[PDB]
Ligand binder design. Structure first.
Ligand SMILES: Nc1nc2c(ncn2[C@@H]2O[C@H](COP(=O)(O)OP(=O)(O)NP(=O)(O)O)[C@@H](O)[C@H]2O)c(=O)[nH]1
Ligand SMILES: [Ca+2]
Ligand SMILES: [Mg+2]
Ligand SMILES: [Mg+2]
Length: 166
């Protein structure tokens, strides 16, 4: 069966682990344990096709930035996550995308931009601001809440589907 190698990236605390754990294990992680680098795998049917999701949950803490090249070499598609209540995390998205593009030596890398924590009302990144950034990349923008599950499957499955247009 087809295996898809997904990598979840973004600034510390934007909800990468919570997003991944909600997809794979169907519960919300309320506590904040910073990640170094974890792996998850799951068999899912997407558009009538059985496939294996291999998901790498990466470190947002800048301390582990040296590990980025290795996983950007391996990953097939990148979920680029910021939190809609954390403008700096939105501003940090580009540093992840620029490096993925260098490492891949390509402008056409399967990616989805994700504005997470859309359940929270303290919004400082407006959806239109993120839409404009996604448009410049030529990639989808999808808002999510790892807490309520809104958009969680859509974001990951859209990323699968971008690796398939590729
Ligand atoms: N309300 C709300 N809280 C969320 C959401 N996603 C994550 N959080 C909360 O935000 C905190 C950080 O979550 P986490 O998933 O660990 O972020 P991270 O991006 O994995 N951090 P790191 O880069 O250090 O591994 C946790 O307390 C988590 O419960 C969301 O969609 N909504
Ligand atoms: Ca919980
Ligand atoms: Mg984490
Ligand atoms: Mg503003």
């Amino acid at each position: 069966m087809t295996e898809y190698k997904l990598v979840v990236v973004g600034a510390g605390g934007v909800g990468k682990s919570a997003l991944t754990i909600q997809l794979i294990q169907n519960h919300f992680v309320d506590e904040y344990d910073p990640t170094i680098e974890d792996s998850y795998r799951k068999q899912v049917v997407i558009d009538g096709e059985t496939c294996l999701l291999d998901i790498l949950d990466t470190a947002g803490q800048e301390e582990y930035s040296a590990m980025r090249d290795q996983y950007m070499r391996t990953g097939e598609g990148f979920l680029c996550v910021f939190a809609i209540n954390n403008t700096k995390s939105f501003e940090d998205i580009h540093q992840y995308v620029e490096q993925i593009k260098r490492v891949k030596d390509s402008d056409d890398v399967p990616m989805v931009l994700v504005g997470n924590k859309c359940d929270l009302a303290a919004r400082t990144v407006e959806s239109r601001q993120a839409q404009d950034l996604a448009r410049s990349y030529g990639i989808p923008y999808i808002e999510t809440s790892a807490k309520t599950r809104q958009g969680v499957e859509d974001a990951f499955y859209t990323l699968v589907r971008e690796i398939r247009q590729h």
